[PDB]
Design a protein around this nucleic acid. Structure first.
Ligand SMILES: Nc1ncnc2c1ncn2[C@@H]1O[C@H](COP(=O)(O)OP(=O)(O)O)[C@@H](O)[C@H]1O
Ligand SMILES: Nc1ncnc2c1ncn2[C@@H]1O[C@H](COP(=O)(O)OP(=O)(O)O)[C@@H](O)[C@H]1O
Ligand SMILES: [Mg+2]
Ligand SMILES: [Mg+2]
Ligand SMILES: [Mn+2]
Ligand SMILES: [Mn+2]
Ligand SMILES: [Mn+2]
Ligand SMILES: [Mn+2]
Lengths: 381, 374, 356, 375
DNA sequence: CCAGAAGCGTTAATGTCTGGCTTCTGATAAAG
DNA sequence: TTTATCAGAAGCCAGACATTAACGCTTCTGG
């Protein structure tokens, strides 16, 4: 039994006043495309299917066109609410979407269901658990502590998974069917989950982590990661919708199809001359999607209108700036001066020299600036 | 809104965990209660946990976060503050707790945790800060800024309402009653004039005269002409709270563009004079009257049944202080539980219910009674 | 041929911070039930469906739970746009609803198939003709119903199918400039929206307003809450039955001074009505509005009712007056003259709708 | 800078030409005096007439000019405050006065006739307003704000110097020393740089700009804050000794930030580094008191001043800290500084018997005091 | 019964500044 | 760990006021 495990779509996310509208749409056809090619029967998207609980109005149309165009294939789909979305937004369309093989289960305490296959045979045992809001399982009491409130939650979700797994043991019975459980949380600053407390399930898809990784050496627990880059630390990385085919009610394979990236992004470190060289690689070559950039300037110089120096570069180029950052975090103040000096006895030549020894500059600009400084002292005299 | 209980631990000088309650054998009356103790040994702190657990912002410190948390005492691992406030019959809870990194007294400061839980069912409503504040605004009906001037009254702040910038006081008036459209129209009209001026870089007359008349950034002009009626409504409640409190003065809205209250001098045959020209005792009593009226303006929507206030009674006169205290007890003929913290020894003879705060003997901390310890 | 005719639902309506949740939820089950009683062909809603372009998140859940319950009826559903409803609020699931016999709406007309598969009638889906999308504003609306009547006449030809007309607009003559009622194209039926008062317009039976199926404001406390069940005879209208909806949330607009009000307050004493009865008390004194409500909260606590509003329709506060009058009060120091006061009055109401 | 005599007429509720002198026998004894009475009897007015006369500005009001004389007692024609004081051994006299229109209780408020004259010389040293302001600035050595946060401390405004924004603290610290040139250097850096950068509508403007974020640009700020840090260190070194003379609770030190701030230190803890915004009320009053004393003692070398007028804040202490603070103030009046204090605290009766005890006329709306002072 | 002077009360040019406002870099809270 | 979002700071424009300088009204007051 094949399943496509993605998550973290983050639909309708504004990205420094830019959108991921066509950036999702050119993925969502590809996700629809690889379904019939690999003959999958039930896609799972485990979490963060919206950015905010009131998404923009097109951000449903990217999602509503997805669920109708799935019905050409007739393949099932499970949608789990993540931490990001308001639960009341996904339960807007829980009841109607049962007509379209789309069990969008938003709230906690839902009943375990049986996945069908393409021929109509039951394909998999599903334990759908969306992101547990802490209100939906635990009640607060008086007399608590600070740390203890986090630990009391952690035991509650743990025995919720032990309870929700035990329902599947009655529902599977004696048939050789695989157990698929979802969730939107973190695992192995003690705000995480211990994976040994996860149930003895056959495969547990998960979410909330954007780096696609195995966790704990158990291959049947896979953070599938985002299908597209949403940041500039993992921009140059790759994205993998997890393909898990099952064999005889057990696990066969974990295939990782890459995603064709439609919107190119890159990050640059260093100083302005190093940014000047890294901008030269886009000179002759052309880009039909305008490439975005992060420019982490680690400069020391003053650099009058540093956003204009960037703006002076990329006028006749197919490169788009989107952000620009500098290490403007530094301290500057007079020391103790051996705890004895008076300001009337120190001349202006001293405290100006006392102010320049705090920076990096050595020789050439210094003998230029001190002439520039002493012109001001004389032009009042 | 009143307070049903309060818990804290290692807040400031009050080391260890302590828990006072407002449904016990003391506080069996709804009478006013005092808090004595040596000066500067945990006295405004018991009235600081009330601000902290409900709005994360003390009167003294601007904000507390993972950075810049001067609040919790030195060589302690965590802090917390927990109220039980009741509106319209139903209890609630709040729980702002913050630990240190690896429970060490010299470590980093982790992300604060909040609850806003219900007390009957036990269920919670907002496990995140940006939802907890806006779900206390719905609940109490009073925002943290409104709470600072219309409920609690901090030390050396009784100059809050009457010595504010007119944008500040007008904004506070527009947050209590009325609607936010009365400055939103000004903001939108400033956008209209900015657009019709960036075009032209009777077209002047489009947003020229109207912009000059009513229209500025963030709702200045038309919001002030809006609150120029709500102030004229509020001054009557100020008068009615004032005459039983201090009969020498009446208030009046001055007919001006910046809304400024104005004293009417009965002992000088209806002399008019500006409100900054008031004595210390008169300014404290008029600010008390104005805040009590300010709470009783939104009393029709939300019942506001509590009023804590710190030192202004050394400032008052030792003869008319008895008149002010008898008028305060006359305001205790409603359910307004009125907390008072000061140092006047005749006043603390008048106030029976004393939460005594014993300062430690050179230890460097403070304590409380064994009934409230935990 | 049975077709239900509803209009102006206004779902998720803010009502002085009180909700219209249980009003609709006790209506929507009743709505499909009468459709389940009489075995309707199709239902049409004549606009003003949601409240605003950004409806609250619960307001969809009544609307979708209607539609999934409509699938157990098998009846066609046609949803028309309104004046307050955007395209983007109804382009949300414009083709989700295609799989559930639910056509939602610059569109070609369509046929309504019956429960047994036969083509039943002819519909002219007419959303709100925005002049931003289409004297001159009166010019294009007038001939469009002549433009679409030929689209109505020639789509059937000699077929014996009745035509119904839709739309969501305003009409001259109907008590609460507009579309002329005498210029309507003589189709077999005209359903129409945006008028919350239920009445026949012009004296022709085939043109109608069914009003709102629930009371919306206190002032509209009329008992004439109807849904128009129409019947067709082989291409011609048979009749229209006005079906009374049940009421669930009673209101009471009490007027006069406190002498006449407090006498009326004992009418709801000791009756123990299971929904709290709502009020619009209209006091007529000179006392202050912030303090006249002090007496009321003690008087309303004893009764099993909940007050909603207090007004004096005759000092004054900001929760009493309207936006023009304070704007007109703000013209005390401004030279209104002749031209200056007219432009400000006309450009002001433009500005107030820009935030609307 | 020690006031010798004060003479006012219709200040607020001191109707009828009330004068005091500190050359009188009860003030000639030591130089420590208290004031008591019912509230609103004009104690702040009595401490207000002197700053009105020396600067035409009060802590309560804003500006008493031709318009908006809110000071003058209701329904009288003229109000005037006049002072004879000393600097460097020799005496001077300031005289501020204001009429109504035509000697009537109401009318057009006229321009305030003022003067500043050397007493026992008969020399009108200053006649108009601005000349009087600048000449008493150079002749007293104190500005307006330096009077109202280092010598006179008004009630409820003692947290001004501790909790001002760092611009209007760097202002006071700049003016306190004779180093006001930085507020011209850093302004002229902006004057050169904005001209050079509007000349581009050039690596030289880049060097001007690299100076321009290395020092202050408009007003003083940056270079000014960098410069007064050493004077703040000198001031907290003085105030540390001043405060441990006062109460052995917290030391002070400067802090490593661009903003000219002072952190406190806890002797009992032995390792405390918190900001001053979380001090207690009584310790904040003692920090403002000792800090003001240190600021006054810093300019000891030139135009040394000897007076202190604490309006209120002693109620914020108790019989366990107030007594210690007054016992330390006794060491200051044993020195040449002659302080004064308004107090409602009856526990300071045994401390200070030298009173300017005032009275009210039965709730009529005026006041009076001992008729041995009145003319 | 009064005119000159002396002072007093009045208005018209100009210098500082308090208040929007805007442009910007800094903090805060949240999803990896 | 990074990304919207608000919050505060520094600088710019400007009208509002403070001040100074000049111009009639009243009043002793002398014959
Ligand atoms: N960072 C801190 N940690 C612990 N205790 C503090 C801290 N800052 C101040 N304190 C102590 O907390 C107490 C608070 O004084 P308090 O009585 O609450 O103020 P007030 O006198 O205005 O009511 C003071 O004794 C002070 O010494
Ligand atoms: N312009 C004025 N007209 C009439 N009365 C005034 C005026 N200014 C002040 N007062 C009276 O003078 C008193 C000033 O009291 P204040 O000196 O401030 O008291 P404290 O010394 O306690 O601060 C107040 O009672 C006030 O009524
Ligand atoms: Mg205190
Ligand atoms: Mg006073
Ligand atoms: Mn996500
Ligand atoms: Mn997530
Ligand atoms: Mn409508
Ligand atoms: Mn309508």
């Amino acid at each position: 039994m094949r399943i496509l495990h993605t998550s973290d779509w983050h639909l309708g996310q504004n990205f420094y006043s830019k959108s991921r509208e066509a950036e999702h749409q050119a993925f969502l056809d590809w996700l629809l495309e690889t379904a019939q090619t690999h003959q999958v029967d039930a896609i799972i998207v485990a979490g963060d299917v919206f950015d905010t609980g009131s998404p923009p109005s097109y951000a449903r149309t990217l999602y509503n066109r997805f669920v109708v165009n799935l019905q050409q294939t007739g393949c099932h789909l499970v949608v789990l609410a993540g931490n990001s979305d308001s639960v009341a937004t996904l339960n807007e369309s829980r009841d109607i979407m049962a007509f379209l093989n789309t069990t969008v289960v938003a709230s906690a305490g839902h009943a375990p269901q049986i996945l069908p296959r393409r021929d109509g045979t039951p394909g998999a045992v599903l334990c759908p658990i969306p992101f547990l809001r802490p209100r939906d399982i635990i009640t607060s009491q008086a007399g608590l502590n600070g740390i203890e409130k986090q630990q009391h939650l952690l035991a509650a979700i743990t025995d919720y998974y032990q309870q929700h797994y035990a329902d599947a043991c009655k529902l599977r019975g004696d048939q050789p069917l695989p157990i698929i459980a979802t969730g939107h949380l973190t695992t192995v600053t003690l705000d995480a989950f211990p994976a040994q407390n996860f149930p003895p399930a056959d495969y547990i898809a998960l979410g909330h982590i954007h780096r696609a990784q195995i966790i704990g050496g158990m291959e049947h627990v896979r953070y599938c990661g985002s299908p597209i880059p949403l940041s500039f630390d993992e921009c140059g990385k790759s994205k993998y919708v997890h393909l898990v085919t099952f064999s005889n009610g057990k696990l066969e394979s974990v295939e990782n199809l890459n995603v064709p990236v439609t919107q190119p992004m890159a990050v640059l470190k260093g100083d302005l001359a190093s940014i000047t060289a890294q901008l030269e690689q886009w000179r002759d070559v052309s880009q039909e999607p305008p490439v975005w950039l992060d420019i982490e300037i680690t400069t020391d110089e003053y650099l009058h209108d540093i956003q204009r120096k960037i703006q002076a570069l990329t006028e006749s180029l197919p490169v788009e700036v989107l952000l620009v950052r500098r290490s403007r975090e530094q301290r500057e103040r007079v020391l103790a001066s051996q705890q004895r000096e008076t300001l009337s006895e120190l001349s202006v030549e001293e405290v100006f020299n006392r102010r320049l020894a705090l920076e990096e500059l050595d020789e050439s600009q210094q003998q230029r600036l001190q002439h520039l400084f002493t012109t001001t002292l004389h032009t009042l005299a | 809104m009143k307070i049903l209980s309060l818990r804290l631990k290692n807040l400031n000088s009050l080391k260890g965990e302590w828990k006072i309650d407002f449904t016990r054998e003391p506080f069996a009356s709804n009478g006013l209660f005092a808090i004595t103790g040596p000066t500067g040994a945990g006295k405004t702190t018991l009235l600081d946990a009330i601000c902290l657990a409900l709005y994360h912002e003390t009167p003294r410190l601007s904000n507390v976060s993972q950075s810049q948390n001067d609040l919790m005492t030195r060589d302690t691992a965590e802090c917390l503050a927990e109220v039980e406030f009741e509106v319209k019959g139903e209890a609630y809870r709040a729980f702002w707790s913050q630990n240190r990194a690896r429970n060490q007294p010299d470590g980093n400061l982790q992300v604060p945790r909040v609850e806003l839980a219900r007390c009957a069912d036990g269920k919670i409503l907002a496990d995140k800060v940006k939802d907890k504040l806006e779900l206390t605004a719905t609940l109490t009906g009073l925002d943290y800024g409104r709470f600072t001037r219309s409920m609690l009254l901090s030390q050396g702040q009784f100059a809050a309402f009457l010595n504010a910038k007119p944008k500040e006081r007008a904004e506070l008036l527009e947050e209590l009653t009325g609607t936010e459209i009365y400055g939103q129209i000004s903001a939108m009209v400033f956008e209209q004039h900015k657009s019709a001026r960036t075009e032209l870089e009777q077209q002047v007359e489009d947003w020229g005269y109207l912009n000059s008349l009513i229209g500025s950034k963030e709702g200045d002009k038309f919001r002030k002409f809006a609150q120029g009626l709500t102030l004229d409504n509020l001054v009557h409640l100020a008068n009615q709270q004032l005459t039983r409190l201090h009969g020498r003065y009446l208030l009046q809205r001055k007919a001006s563009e910046a809304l400024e209250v104005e004293v009417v001098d009965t002992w000088q045959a209806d002399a008019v004079r500006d409100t900054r020209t008031l004595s210390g005792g008169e300014s404290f009593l008029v600010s008390l009257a104005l805040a009590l009226a300010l709470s009783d303006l939104v009393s029709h929507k939300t019942r506001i049944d509590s009023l804590f206030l710190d030192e202004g009674f050394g400032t008052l006169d030792s003869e008319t202080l008895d008149t002010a205290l008898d008028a305060l007890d006359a305001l205790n003929a409603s359910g307004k539980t009125i907390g008072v913290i000061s140092h006047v020894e005749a006043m603390k003879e008048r106030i029976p219910v004393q939460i005594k705060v014993k300062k430690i003997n050179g230890l460097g901390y403070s304590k409380l009674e064994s009934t409230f310890a935990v």
